[PDB]
Structures are given as structure tokens and as C-alpha cells.
Amino acid sequence: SGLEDKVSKQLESKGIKFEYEEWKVPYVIPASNHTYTPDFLLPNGIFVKTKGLWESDDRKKHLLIREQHPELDIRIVFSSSRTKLYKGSPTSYGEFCEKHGIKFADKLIPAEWIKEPKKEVPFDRLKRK
Amino acid sequence: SGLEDKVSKQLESKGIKFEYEEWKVPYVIPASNHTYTPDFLLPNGIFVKTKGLWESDDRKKHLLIREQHPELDIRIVFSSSRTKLYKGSPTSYGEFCEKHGIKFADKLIPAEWIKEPKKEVPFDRLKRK
Structure with a gap:
């Protein structure tokens, strides 16, 4: 300097x-x-998060939550899962998701997700808003 | 949303x-x-860090360093200690330093710091670059 x-x-x-x-x-x-x-x-019992822009910190948080709460089923609905990780990246949100086993869709919650059989949600491990 | x-x-x-x-x-x-x-x-034995911009992230790290290595004497020379913590903040870099006991100067290392009596640095606690 x-x-x-x-x-x-x-x-x-x-x-x-x-x-x-x-x-x-x-x-x-x-x-x-x-x-x-x-x-x-x-x-x-499926949790869904809707996302427009999805930044690197958000991605990391997602992985941590998955590793720390294997029993939770958290999925994402994107405005567009084709958006790139960043201005020059060749990989998109959806690609990142497939790589890490994150279930996702675009725009709306797919009818098939809603039909999946109920599963228990360990609410004791969560904090009501 | x-x-x-x-x-x-x-x-x-x-x-x-x-x-x-x-x-x-x-x-x-x-x-x-x-x-x-x-x-x-x-x-x-005095360590000196020089800083132009000195944002939230650096400041927080500085405090963790002081806490974990109280045996070191680390001081800061700023381009300007009058700079505000961030846009809209009332507090300057110099005021944050005074509040946390961090010694600092502006533009050059004070002649008087150079004159302070020598203190041993525990190099065994450090890592050479």
C-alpha cells in the first residue's frame, strides 16, 4: 500500500x-x-424456502443445516434455478442443488411434493416464531 | 416476496x-x-499494522486477536483515524480504538513508540511467514 x-x-x-x-x-x-x-x-412435514437471489453464504448455511439436522426435509423453490452461482460461474443454483442432494423446483411447489406421505417433524428441536 | x-x-x-x-x-x-x-x-517488540479502510470485519478480528494473544503489543497506524466506522456512524476509527484500549497513530509510526524499552516477543507462539 x-x-x-x-x-x-x-x-x-x-x-x-x-x-x-x-x-x-x-x-x-x-x-x-x-x-x-x-x-x-x-x-x-416438508419445509419449503422460496428464493430469488441465492448467495454463497445462503448456500453454506443450507449445507450446515442439512449436516446438523439430517431429519429435516427442507426444499427450495427458486424464481429460477438456472441463475448462475455468480456473474462468471458456469454452474447454476439447480446444479449446486443436485450436487448436494437438495430437492428444488422453480416458481411453484410441485404437486408431487404435496402428495408425498407424511413424516414426523421433531418440533422439540425447533423454535416457534 | x-x-x-x-x-x-x-x-x-x-x-x-x-x-x-x-x-x-x-x-x-x-x-x-x-x-x-x-x-x-x-x-x-511492538507490532504495527497499517490501515486505510478498517471495516467491521477487520475490527472484530482485531478484538479476537487481542483476547487470544494478550502477550502481544499490536498497534495501528491509520491513513486517517477520523474516518467513520461506516456510512452514517457517529464514531471514528480512533474513537473505537480508545474505547477498546487499542494504541494508534496517523500516517507514520510515532517517534516515541520507536523509543519505548524493548520487550521480548514470544516467537514460539508465532508462525514465520
Whole structure:
């Protein structure tokens, strides 16, 4: 940076020795608690989240929830599952979903999802809004 | 949400009873491991980080570093300590530093910091770049 160079030059002109970007200090960012609220809970126990833009942080959250709550059935309905992960990506939302086993559709909840046999929802593990 | 409105209307037209944003799924964002590299290390043991922009993310990391490595003396030289924390904030970088006991200066390293008596740095706690 311009700032860094002015600081370096100043030290040098005064003959001050120094170590430059020589040492790393490790540290850990603690784990944090959050909540995610699906838009709909269907009678057969399927949760559905509707999404327009779907950012990288959202994708990550999705994977964490899946790994932490294998018993929940959370699906996504996209304005478009063809949108790319980002401006230059070759992969779309839908592709990401198929890669990670996330059930999804576009625009509306498919009639077949609604017909699936009921399954229990561990509400005790959830927090009512 | 226009999309959410279309999903709801479709459900209602099929007589589907659903719970709308009624349940929150708790989840945990995992701890993450990082390292921070001060720009300069002076002969007396003082570490100096130079910053132009110094956003929320950096500030939070700085506090975690101080907490986890209280044995280190890390200070900041800013292009300007008058800069606000973010658009609309009443607080400057310098004021946030004073509130948390972070030593700082503007533009160059103070001649007086260079003169402070030497303190040993526990290099065994650090990682060379």
C-alpha cells in the first residue's frame, strides 16, 4: 500500500531496523448460533424456502443445516434455478442443488411434493416464531 | 416476496393447510482458523499494522486477536483515524480504538513508540511467514 511504503521509507530514513510482514499470529473465530426460517411447512412435514437471489453464504448455511439436522426435509423453490452461482460461474443454483442432494423446483411447489406421505417433524428441536 | 405470494396462492387454491414462517431451525456456523500478519515488527517488540479502510470485519478480528494473544503489543497506524466506522456512524476509527484500549497513530509510526524499552516477543507462539 502507499501507506505501508511511507511507513517503510520513514523507518529506513531514520535508520530503524524492522521485520516486514515476517510473522503470523494464529487465532480462532468462535462458532456462532443462528436460526433459519423456512417460508412454508407443508402438512406432510416438508419445509419449503422460496428464493430469488441465492448467495454463497445462503448456500453454506443450507449445507450446515442439512449436516446438523439430517431429519429435516427442507426444499427450495427458486424464481429460477438456472441463475448462475455468480456473474462468471458456469454452474447454476439447480446444479449446486443436485450436487448436494437438495430437492428444488422453480416458481411453484410441485404437486408431487404435496402428495408425498407424511413424516414426523421433531418440533422439540425447533423454535416457534 | 412476489414469489412467496404466488406459492401461497397456489397452495390455498389446492386447499393445502400450511404454516407460514412459523418455525425457526437453529444451526451453528463452525469455528474457523485464521492468522493475522502485522505489517511491521519494531526492534523493541511492538507490532504495527497499517490501515486505510478498517471495516467491521477487520475490527472484530482485531478484538479476537487481542483476547487470544494478550502477550502481544499490536498497534495501528491509520491513513486517517477520523474516518467513520461506516456510512452514517457517529464514531471514528480512533474513537473505537480508545474505547477498546487499542494504541494508534496517523500516517507514520510515532517517534516515541520507536523509543519505548524493548520487550521480548514470544516467537514460539508465532508462525514465520
